RNA sequence: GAAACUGCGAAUGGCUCAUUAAAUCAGUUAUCGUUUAUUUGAUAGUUCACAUGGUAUAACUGUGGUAAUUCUAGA
RNA sequence: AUUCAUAAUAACUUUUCGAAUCGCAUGGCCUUGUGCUGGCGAUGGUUCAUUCAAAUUUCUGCCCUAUCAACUUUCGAUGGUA
């Protein structure tokens, strides 16, 4: 799945192509606005924490 | 919605009318307020030409007038005890126009002590000059002073809480008072 | 009976916190509206604790004559 | 028409207040007005005890528009009568007339007392009820 | 001077005659029983920082979604 | 023709309004400072009146049928009070 991640301090943004479904499985059963830690979705984003702001599903 | 036109009723001769027109907007009606007591809540209704209208629900206090003294005080509402239109309208503690109701009666006797110096139930020279000037006027009637001893008065709601948003009334005096207690004493 | 009075002290310190809160948060159009509902927020509490300690004090005119006096 | 306080509400004229503090003449304050157009206020309207919100002399209505004349054909309603107006409709092909009539319901105050066959003159007011648009202003028969 | 915010207009016009028989409509009244943008003419010395006070947000930039709509998300 | 217009009292209000807006000309007074005053308009704004209206409404008038004579009121019909 695709992760549109934005840093508001620098104001930058980039989509990440993410595979290996058990990395994005930690996002499941979570609400918009709940924060999520970074190492569960990836050790490249280790130490980071993100806030879920929404998204788009299929169709 | 709720229609207000006379085209949907029968004729004077008794004949059915046919469907001549759809419901126009200028003949609309709206649902009743059914204003309870306690914990004030007024909503706004947008009406024809603008002209915002206040729909009152659960009003608590209101401005009541003593007509014989020519005064008016803001007093709270205890409860409705008689309604000429419906007895369920009494039973649900609803307030409409012309509802017989009980009021708290404390600021009225505060004003009576301040204006006349006599007590109900049972110091400076300016005050004595006022009280001697206001002689022969502490002889109101026996019914309202015995009500004052009881601590509540019977008042009639003279305002429409549905259209205006306020619950305003006036204190019962004389023949109308005696008629309403004759009506509510029937048991 | 003292714990009920301590709850009453908690009640009126929370009440003066309420009073200061929506006396500072009010605007010119809305100040005159809250003041009555400040006093109203006093009033039943000014009753309520009293009958509560009247429970602690419990712990330890008809319409007919109103017609008849006219005669 | 035997007592005044039969209904459940207190019948009284609106915004006409008799002071219980004072004690003077004119036992109840009775507001009245003259309807105009030369129509005489009856003496029992001044001296009466009925209230009748829709009365043209003691109530909150006004007389304007048409002035009609009729013969009372029904009177057993409560403060309402039904009159009949008769006229001739002209057919121009046969060059002659025919008899037609209309039934008008009209509100009657207790200031007047009418029976069947009385001739009354009425004046138009605002809608009193579903069908009543007129109010009787002068009775001229027996 | 594009775009966009704001304000108006979009309830006018145009078309058709299915419904509808005291209904519509014609001439004639009334509102002392009401609403009224717009014109037009009048009409506020009285008010819980005043050389003038606060906050978002579109347009814009950039990252995107689905086959597709005058679809829209996050920053 | 009015409990009308309007006024005055006691108050009342999930309190309405009473300009923090914009363009041209830039002028007069001096205790000469960005000091004080000052024009022609545009937009908005409370209420009244006017206009463009609207909604109800009075009277009278509609084609063929009795092989339609009684119709209306369950649960609105006709009127009164609220």
UniProtKB/Swiss-Prot annotation, chain A:
Main location: cytoplasm
Record's keyword annotation contains Ubl conjugation: yes
Subcellular location: Cytoplasm; Nucleus, Nucleolus
UniProt KW Ribosomal protein keyword: yes
GO CC entries: 90S preribosome; cytosol; cytosolic small ribosomal subunit; nucleolus; nucleoplasm; small-subunit processome
Gene Ontology process terms (BP): maturation of SSU-rRNA from tricistronic rRNA transcript (SSU-rRNA, 5.8S rRNA, LSU-rRNA); translation
Keywords of the record: Cytoplasm, Isopeptide bond, Nucleus, Phosphoprotein, Ribonucleoprotein, Ribosomal protein, Ribosome biogenesis, rRNA processing, Ubl conjugation
Highest taxon listed in the record's lineage: Eukaryota
Gene Ontology MF, one: structural constituent of ribosome
Miscellaneous note of the record: Present with 66000 molecules/cell in log phase SD medium.
Subunit architecture: Component of the small ribosomal subunit (SSU). Mature yeast ribosomes consist of a small (40S) and a large (60S) subunit. The 40S small subunit contains 1 molecule of ribosomal RNA (18S rRNA) and 33 different proteins (encoded by 57 genes). The large 60S subunit contains 3 rRNA molecules (25S, 5.8S and 5S rRNA) and 46 different proteins (encoded by 81 genes). Interacts with snoRNA U3. uS11 interacts with MPP10. Component of the ribosomal small subunit (SSU) processome composed of at least 40 protein subunits and snoRNA U3.
Family: Belongs to the eukaryotic ribosomal protein eS6 family.
Protein name: Small ribosomal subunit protein eS6A
Protein's gene: RPS6A
Curated annotation (Swiss-Prot), chain B:
Alphabetical UniProt keywords: Cytoplasm, Phosphoprotein, Ribonucleoprotein, Ribosomal protein
Protein name from the UniProt record: Small ribosomal subunit protein eS8B
Classification via InterPro entries: Ribosomal_eS8 (IPR001047), Ribosomal_eS8_CS (IPR018283), Ribosomal_protein_eS8_euk (IPR042563), Ribosomal_Se8/biogenesis_NSA2 (IPR022309)
An annotated GO cellular component: cytosolic small ribosomal subunit
Other facts: Present with 14400 molecules/cell in log phase SD medium. There are 2 genes for eS8 in yeast.
Subunit structure: Component of the small ribosomal subunit (SSU). Mature yeast ribosomes consist of a small (40S) and a large (60S) subunit. The 40S small subunit contains 1 molecule of ribosomal RNA (18S rRNA) and 33 different proteins (encoded by 57 genes). The large 60S subunit contains 3 rRNA molecules (25S, 5.8S and 5S rRNA) and 46 different proteins (encoded by 81 genes).
Pfam families named among the record's database cross-references: Ribosomal_S8e
Provenance organism: Saccharomyces cerevisiae (strain ATCC 204508 / S288c) (Baker's yeast)
PANTHER family per the UniProt record, alphabetical: 40S RIBOSOMAL PROTEIN S8
Domain of life: Eukaryota
Gene: RPS8B
Record localization: Cytoplasm
Swiss-Prot record, chain C:
Domain of life of the native organism: Eukaryota
Region (Disordered): 11-34
Coiled coil: none
Other observations noted: Present with 172 molecules/cell in log phase SD medium.
Protein name: OTU domain-containing protein 2
Organism per entry: Saccharomyces cerevisiae (strain ATCC 204508 / S288c)
Gene (UniProt): OTU2
From Swiss-Prot, chain D:
InterPro entries per record: NA-bd_OB-fold, Ribosomal_uS17, Ribosomal_uS17_arc/euk, Ribosomal_uS17_CS, Ribosomal_uS17_N
Gene Ontology CC entries for this record: 90S preribosome; cytosol; cytosolic small ribosomal subunit
Cross-link Glycyl lysine isopeptide (Lys-Gly) (interchain with G-Cter in ubiquitin): residue positions: 12, 43, 53-54, 76, 93, 102, 130, 138
Family: Belongs to the universal ribosomal protein uS17 family.
Record Gene3D superfamilies: 2.40.50.1000
Location, primary (coarse class): cytoplasm
Protein name: Small ribosomal subunit protein uS17A
Function according to Swiss-Prot or TrEMBL: Component of the ribosome, a large ribonucleoprotein complex responsible for the synthesis of proteins in the cell. The small ribosomal subunit (SSU) binds messenger RNAs (mRNAs) and translates the encoded message by selecting cognate aminoacyl-transfer RNA (tRNA) molecules. The large subunit (LSU) contains the ribosomal catalytic site termed the peptidyl transferase center (PTC), which catalyzes the formation of peptide bonds, thereby polymerizing the amino acids delivered by tRNAs into a polypeptide chain.
Gene this chain is encoded by: RPS11A
Pfam families in UniProt: Ribosomal_S17 (PF00366), Ribosomal_S17_N (PF16205)
PTM comment text: N-terminally acetylated by acetyltransferase NatA.
Gene Ontology MF, one: structural constituent of ribosome
Compartments it resides in: Cytoplasm
Assigned keywords, A-Z: Acetylation, Cytoplasm, Isopeptide bond, Ribonucleoprotein, Ribosomal protein, RNA-binding, rRNA-binding, Ubl conjugation
A Gene Ontology BP annotation from the UniProt entry: ribosomal small subunit assembly
């Amino acid at each position: 799945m695709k992760l549109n991640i934005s840093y508001p301090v620098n104001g930058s943004q980039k989509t990440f192509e993410i595979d290996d479904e058990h990395r994005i499985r930690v996002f499941f059963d979570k609400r918009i606005g709940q924060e999520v830690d970074g190492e569960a979705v990836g050790d490249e984003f280790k130490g980071y924490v993100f806030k879920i702001s929404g998204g788009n599903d299929k169709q | 919605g709720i229609s207000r036109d006379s085209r949907h009723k029968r004729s004077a001769t008794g004949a059915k009318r046919a469907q001549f027109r759809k419901k126009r907007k200028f003949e609309l009606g709206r649902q009743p307020a059914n204003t309870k007591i306690g914990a004030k809540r007024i909503h706004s209704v947008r009406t024809r030409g603008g002209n915002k209208k206040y729909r009152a629900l659960r009003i608590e206090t209101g401005n009541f007038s003593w007509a014989s003294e020519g005064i008016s005080k803001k007093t709270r509402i205890a409860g409705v005890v008689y309604h000429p239109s419906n007895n369920e309208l009494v039973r649900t503690n609803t307030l409409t126009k012309a509802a017989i109701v009980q009021i708290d009666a404390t600021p009225f006797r505060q004003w009576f002590e301040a204006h006349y110096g006599q007590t109900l139930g049972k110091k400076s020279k300016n005050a004595e000059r006022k009280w001697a000037a206001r002689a022969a006027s502490a002889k109101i009637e026996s019914s309202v002073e015995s009500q004052f001893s009881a601590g509540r008065l019977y008042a009639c709601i003279s305002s429409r809480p549905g259209q205006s948003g306020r619950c305003d009334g006036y204190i019962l005096e004389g023949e109308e008072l005696a008629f309403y207690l004759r009506r509510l004493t029937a048991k | 009976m003292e714990d009920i009075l301590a709850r009453h002290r908690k009640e009126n310190k929370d009440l003066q916190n309420k009073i200061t809160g929506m006396k500072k948060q009010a605007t010119k159009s809305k100040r005159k509206e809250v003041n009555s509902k400040c006093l109203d927020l006093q009033d039943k509490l000014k009753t309520k604790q009293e009958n509560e300690i009247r429970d602690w004090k419990i712990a330890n005119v008809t319409p007919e004559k109103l017609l008849e006096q006219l005669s | 028409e035997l007592t005044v306080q039969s209904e459940r509400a207190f019948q009284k004229q609106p915004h006409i207040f008799n002071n219980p503090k004072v004690k003077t003449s004119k036992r109840t304050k009775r507001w009245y007005k003259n309807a105009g157009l030369g129509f005489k206020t009856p003496k029992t309207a001044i001296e009466g005890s009925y209230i009748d919100k829709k009365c043209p002399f003691t109530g909150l209505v006004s007389i304007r528009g048409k002035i009609l004349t009729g013969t009372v054909v029904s009177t057993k309603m409560h403060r309402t009568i039904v009159i009949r107006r008769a006229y001739l409709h002209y057919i121009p092909k046969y060059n002659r007339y025919e008899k037609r009539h209309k039934n008008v319901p009209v509100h009657v105050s207790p200031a007047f007392r009418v029976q069947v066959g009385d001739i009354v003159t009425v004046g138009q007011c605002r809608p009193i009820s579903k069908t009543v648009r007129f109010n009787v202003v002068k009775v001229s028969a027996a």
